[model samples]
Target: GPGSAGRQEEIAEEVARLLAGVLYLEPDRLDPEETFLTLGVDSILGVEFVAAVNAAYPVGVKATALYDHPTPAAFARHIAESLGA
Candidate 1:
């Protein structure tokens, strides 16, 4: 089921918060519309980030999944889909 309006955005916000903790940055500084790379997320750290995400959520998104969902919004959409929200 599709999530209510802003639910995906909420997920994206949490994603940014998770990534911020991982990357040692301010969560608000991360624009969901921007690519992880654009936000200075390199692959080396992406692995850790993915692990954190998987640990937090039930999704099995791989470390390389960053290539597919490069933005927090996109990633959240995947998460929302996985959650059947």
Candidate 2:
């Protein structure tokens, strides 16, 4: 359980870092609560984010999932939960 929690946190951080690059904002400025739309992340950027996430984490997710998750923290949680954590 502890390992799962740790892994979730790792995923969250990784997602945030990736999002920072895509959003053109510093990692320090990226908040977990911030929505992709607010950061000017359109469908194209959303697809890019999913590709990056899959490439980085080996967690296959679709572009639509990003729309559903909306935020890095939510997406990270979705990935972790999908992995059975």
Candidate 3:
């Protein structure tokens, strides 16, 4: 259980880092409330983000999932829930 919680946090952090790198911004630039569109993440990066998430997660996640939930916190929660954590 502890590992699962830690893994979830790791997943969130990795997602943030990927977002930062793809947006050409610092990881610190991300705010849970800040939208991806506002961060200059367009359709191209969106697909990339999905690919990156799949690389990080045990089960591959989809780019469309990001669109479903547009906020960092919301998306993280979705991943955690989907993973049955």
Candidate 4:
């Protein structure tokens, strides 16, 4: 069943996929421990990510929202929270 747990996983996977594409790498290549900045991600790419993610929500997401949730897991959690899940 695609319940809350499944929905959460899907959102996390979405975040990872977006992160990978924005970082110009494969999704599998993004390690949970890797800092996005260390992966050569600059503000421009961050803005792209924010735009894509904001599309899934009504309100826009600020590019700097990612700074508060640096890790992949944390970022996914932040997205879920933003969606009010």
Candidate 2 accuracy as lDDT: 0.80
For each of the candidates, the C-alpha root-mean-square deviation to the true structure, in angstroms, is 2.7, 2.7, 3.6, 3.4
How many pairs of residues in model 4 come into backbone collision?
Answer: 0
lDDT agreement of model 1 with the native: 0.83
lDDT of each: 0.83, 0.80, 0.72, 0.73
Q: Please, what are the lDDT tens digits per residue for candidate 3 over residues 1-85? A: 4555655575566678777877778888786567777777777888887777777666567777767877665677677777865
Error of 1 at 14 (Å): 0.5
Q: Which stretches of candidate 2 lie over 4 Å from their true place?
A: 1-5
The total of clashing pairs for model 2 equals 0
- Per-residue lDDT tens digits for candidate 2, residues 1-85, read 5554667787888888887787678788777778877766888878877888888776678888877877788889989887765
**lDDT tens digits, residues 1-85, model 4?**
4455745567777777877888889987787657777766777888888888778655466877777766666677666776776
Query: What overall lDDT, based on C-alpha atoms, would model 4 receive against the true structure?
Result: 0.73
Off by more than 4 A, model 1: 1-6
* Model 4 misplacement above 4 A: 1-6
TM value for model 2: 0.82
Q: 2 or 4: which has the higher lDDT?
A: 2
Indicate the TM-score of model 1.
Answer: 0.86
TM-score of 3: 0.75
